[PDB]
Design a protein around this motif. Sequence first.
Motif, PDB file in Angstrom:
ATOM      1  N   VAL A 183       0.835  -1.190   0.000  1.00  0.00           N
ATOM      2  CA  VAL A 183       0.000   0.000   0.000  1.00  0.00           C
ATOM      3  C   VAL A 183       0.871   1.242   0.000  1.00  0.00           C
ATOM      4  CG1 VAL A 183      -2.001  -1.066   1.052  1.00  0.00           C
ATOM      5  CG2 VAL A 183      -0.224  -0.078   2.508  1.00  0.00           C
ATOM      6  N   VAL A 184       0.326   2.308  -0.571  1.00  0.00           N
ATOM      7  CA  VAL A 184       0.965   3.611  -0.601  1.00  0.00           C
ATOM      8  C   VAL A 184      -0.041   4.636  -0.098  1.00  0.00           C
ATOM      9  CG1 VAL A 184       0.388   3.699  -3.051  1.00  0.00           C
ATOM     10  CG2 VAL A 184       1.955   5.402  -2.074  1.00  0.00           C
ATOM     11  N   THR A 185       0.419   5.537   0.764  1.00  0.00           N
ATOM     12  CA  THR A 185      -0.401   6.625   1.278  1.00  0.00           C
ATOM     13  C   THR A 185      -0.124   7.874   0.450  1.00  0.00           C
ATOM     14  OG1 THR A 185      -0.455   5.726   3.526  1.00  0.00           O
ATOM     15  CG2 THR A 185      -0.898   8.083   3.256  1.00  0.00           C
ATOM     16  N   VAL A 186      -1.158   8.394  -0.205  1.00  0.00           N
ATOM     17  CA  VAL A 186      -1.014   9.575  -1.057  1.00  0.00           C
ATOM     18  C   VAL A 186      -2.005  10.642  -0.604  1.00  0.00           C
ATOM     19  CG1 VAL A 186      -0.504   7.936  -2.903  1.00  0.00           C
ATOM     20  CG2 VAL A 186      -2.700   9.136  -2.885  1.00  0.00           C
ATOM     21  N   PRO A 187      -1.706  11.923  -0.805  1.00  0.00           N
ATOM     22  CA  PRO A 187      -2.717  12.956  -0.554  1.00  0.00           C
ATOM     23  C   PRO A 187      -3.925  12.749  -1.454  1.00  0.00           C
ATOM     24  CG  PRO A 187      -0.821  13.853  -1.734  1.00  0.00           C
ATOM     25  CD  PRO A 187      -0.424  12.497  -1.248  1.00  0.00           C
ATOM     26  N   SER A 188      -5.115  12.943  -0.878  1.00  0.00           N
ATOM     27  CA  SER A 188      -6.347  12.636  -1.598  1.00  0.00           C
ATOM     28  C   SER A 188      -6.517  13.507  -2.836  1.00  0.00           C
ATOM     29  CB  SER A 188      -7.550  12.791  -0.667  1.00  0.00           C
ATOM     30  OG  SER A 188      -7.321  13.804   0.296  1.00  0.00           O
ATOM     31  N   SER A 189      -5.996  14.735  -2.807  1.00  0.00           N
ATOM     32  CA  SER A 189      -6.090  15.603  -3.977  1.00  0.00           C
ATOM     33  C   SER A 189      -5.335  15.014  -5.163  1.00  0.00           C
ATOM     34  CB  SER A 189      -5.562  16.996  -3.640  1.00  0.00           C
ATOM     35  OG  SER A 189      -6.387  17.631  -2.679  1.00  0.00           O
TER      36      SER A 189
END
Lengths: 215, 214, 408
Positions: A183-189
């Motif tokens: 998994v990768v955490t990215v800014p929702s924008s």
Amino acid sequence: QLQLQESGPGVVKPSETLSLTCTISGGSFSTYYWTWIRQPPGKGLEWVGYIGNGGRSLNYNPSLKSRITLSVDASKNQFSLKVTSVTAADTAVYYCGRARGLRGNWFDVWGPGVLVTVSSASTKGPSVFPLAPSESTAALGCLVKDYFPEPVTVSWNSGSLTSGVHTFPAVLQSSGLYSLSSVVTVPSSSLGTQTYVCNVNHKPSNTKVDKRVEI
Amino acid sequence: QAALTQPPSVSGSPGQSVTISCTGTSSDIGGYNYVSWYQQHPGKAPKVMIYEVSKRPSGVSDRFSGSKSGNIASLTISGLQAEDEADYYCSSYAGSNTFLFGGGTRLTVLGQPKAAPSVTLFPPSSEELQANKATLVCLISDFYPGAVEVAWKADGSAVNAGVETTKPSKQSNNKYAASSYLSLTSDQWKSHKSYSCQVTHEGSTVEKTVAPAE
Amino acid sequence: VCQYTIQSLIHLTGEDPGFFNVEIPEFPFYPTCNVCTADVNVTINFDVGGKKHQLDLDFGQLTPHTKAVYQPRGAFGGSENATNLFLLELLGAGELALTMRSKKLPINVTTGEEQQVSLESVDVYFQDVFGTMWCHHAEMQNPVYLIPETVPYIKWDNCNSTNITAVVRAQGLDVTLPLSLPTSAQDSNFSVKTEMLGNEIDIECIMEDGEISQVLPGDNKFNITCSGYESHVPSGGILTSTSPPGTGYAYSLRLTPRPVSRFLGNNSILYVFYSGNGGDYCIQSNIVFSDEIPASQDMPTNTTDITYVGDNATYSVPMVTSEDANSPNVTVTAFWAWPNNTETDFKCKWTLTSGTPSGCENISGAFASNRTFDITVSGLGTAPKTLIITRTATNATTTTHKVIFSKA
Ligand SMILES: *[C@@H]1O[C@H](CO[C@@H]2O[C@@H](C)[C@@H](O)[C@@H](O)[C@@H]2O)[C@@H](O)[C@H](O)[C@H]1NC(C)=O
Ligand SMILES: *[C@@H]1O[C@H](CO)[C@@H](O)[C@H](O)[C@H]1NC(C)=O
Ligand SMILES: *[C@@H]1O[C@H](CO)[C@@H](O)[C@H](O)[C@H]1NC(C)=O
Ligand SMILES: *[C@@H]1O[C@H](CO)[C@@H](O)[C@H](O)[C@H]1NC(C)=O
Ligand SMILES: *[C@@H]1O[C@H](CO)[C@@H](O)[C@H](O)[C@H]1NC(C)=O
Ligand SMILES: *[C@@H]1O[C@H](CO)[C@@H](O)[C@H](O)[C@H]1NC(C)=O
Ligand SMILES: *[C@@H]1O[C@H](CO)[C@@H](O)[C@H](O)[C@H]1NC(C)=O
Ligand SMILES: *[C@@H]1O[C@H](CO)[C@@H](O)[C@H](O)[C@H]1NC(C)=O
Ligand SMILES: *[C@@H]1O[C@H](CO)[C@@H](O)[C@H](O)[C@H]1NC(C)=O
Ligand SMILES: *[C@@H]1O[C@H](CO)[C@@H](O)[C@H](O)[C@H]1NC(C)=O
């Protein structure tokens, strides 16, 4: 700077020959010694042997001497290790390294290591599924499902997406197959604009797959 | 693996000095000045800290020093930092162009803060449901005390069949990670209103819930 | 009974190659003296499982003008035929080295235990013609256990032969090897390793920096580090590139590995393995050990002229560089150039609190405040005569002056 890269088969059948090669870049064999080290999963290090003096010195671990062959191919910037009559005792991560100083006592540069699994069980390539999810940051992922031979590598956006990526250690099912998730955490924008693709590599089954992970 | 003798583990507090011994014979450690020490972090190749008993490669701080007396070699780490948590191996020449490694020593840095786990729960993907399967993925990360309990629920009631959970694994930041999987048929997924992954750590619980509804 | 003692530390680099070596650089070897001798005795202190065992060797009288390699004349506590394991060699410029074969035990010990013995220190005793007793204590900073045997026969299979023979003088090897590489100097990374094999000895030398990396026009000097007990003179190498066709690129490689012991034997083999990266090349050559005397064993001197009138002349001996005022012991000696009778010619010796000895003729000495030593000579004729004055202090460096007295 000198960089080393091991490359092997992933899975070796019992009593067959294990064949590995190390590729050298940013440097030359020159006058150094070149060595192989191995480490069974969860265990300690063991010295396999090294080759030096332009191939004139072949020195092996006395407990593995009769099964080991080291060779060098300077025209391809490669040197190799062969292990005959293999068993599950030879399942290990194998490292190649540069050995410098007197007698090559100083192993100063190491490759990242390659896992080699000795098994008579049939190999199995995985199925890959996307893991789609207001919040400031969002998590996306890939599920790598039901593969037998252990080493599986996941990168994101061809390896350009590094920060915020966590690939989890695989679970071993009762069937004897593995599954893992990355998994990768990215800014929702960034999710709306940028597409995220996971690259899955399972060398034992020669599997290369890219999966778009779209909301 | 024929090896040299090291203690299985040592521990220290930040700012302290920790010493790791490595015992050989007059044919390897006491017979030559070719003792090396290696640092190995989880999932990485070993890195040389010391070679030739006491010589430090460029780039490794002088907090690491090596010495030898008789057949016993020692690595000393002063000013201990949380970054120093790793496995440490000694090696020595043994004559006739051969090398022996120690068994390894696991170093623990004490007093590190407690950290609650971060829990993410994923529902089955549309592709897998088309294959008539549904696995739920519960990812657990960043808990420092490396022990955790995972329990699954379906419509608020405990579920045992189809659960597979990993042992915790040490991360680069010295915290731990784990995952749990609930494997279902697509029919089971669509016949329930909700599923939950509850994670217990140091007496606290974190729960996450997914529903088949859009 | 030591008037002056000097401490030193012996460092072992890597491994014992089959011989132990220690250098003693501070003993006086007076210049312009055919009759100057020295009585030398050496004790080796061994640790044997925590218990201490002494080995005393007698090296007789050194005669530097006629002999440069000495075998011990007698041993106490030695294993049989042990005297055979030791050599004393003069190196030139007032220095000497002591060597021991390290693959056979020089002391008889129990087979069951005491198998591993370690050398702890070496004591060297040196008495000159003035009767001054000099002592050197060399302590093993990083010792290893002495391992008998372990001497497999080694030969390298594919190395181009060279008719060039490397000669060793005063333990130092010096050889120049022409070679050719396909790489120009600008685009070359040069590395070389050597190995010397013979009798019971195997020495390896490498570049601790790995390779020269970019090679420059002209001389490219670089250090080499050899296995074993290191000399205070570093080993070196020089790669010389020619100035700027289809022909190759010519270079000369000069190698000077410093601690090479004649225990290797005549016609041992030097292997040179080198590589030029834009492959691999190996050259082998024979090595022989010169038996010539250095003929420059005299210690370094300071020559100065003094002009006098009449038959009296004065000279002031300055303090030694390392010597300071209040130094506990200061010794000054003097004798006329080219003496011929040891019984009379070496009677002039002064300590801080001794005065002029009765046996010193036509010379007076006294320490002034600030510790400058004033010499007066009262019998000078008309022909020039040269005076040799030697001054030492407890922790200071012995210094010798050649003073030429000339009439105005
Ligand atoms: C040196 O010692 C002589 C007597 O013993 C001899 O030397 C010792 C070191 C052993 O090798 C032993 O076997 C020899 O027999 C003395 O006669 C001689 O005067 C001593 N010289 C000095 C003053 O150092
Ligand atoms: C001065 O020389 C004597 C021998 O004559 C020696 O015993 C003494 O230790 C020396 N003094 C010092 C302080 O070294
Ligand atoms: C045995 O050791 C003693 C040590 O004092 C020595 O004097 C004696 O000569 C030795 N004998 C032999 C045969 O080596
Ligand atoms: C020492 O040399 C003599 C020479 O005659 C020989 O007979 C004797 O056996 C040798 N002993 C040892 C200990 O080598
Ligand atoms: C030898 O070592 C010294 C000190 O490390 C260094 O300054 C020098 O560059 C090296 N090589 C030469 C050219 O002497
Ligand atoms: C011998 O010299 C030739 C010259 O072309 C070279 O190619 C070869 O590598 C050399 N071999 C050795 C062992 O030095
Ligand atoms: C080799 O020849 C003889 C026999 O050892 C020896 O005298 C000589 O010093 C040795 N080396 C040379 C040629 O100097
Ligand atoms: C040499 O001796 C002269 C005369 O005493 C003195 O002035 C000079 O400093 C000395 N130089 C050295 C280098 O010893
Ligand atoms: C030394 O030689 C001188 C003449 O040069 C001579 O007069 C003297 O007798 C010799 N020394 C002795 C004391 O024999
Ligand atoms: C030390 O004393 C001597 C003798 O009087 C004198 O020649 C010399 O100049 C003095 N030097 C110093 C530095 O005091």
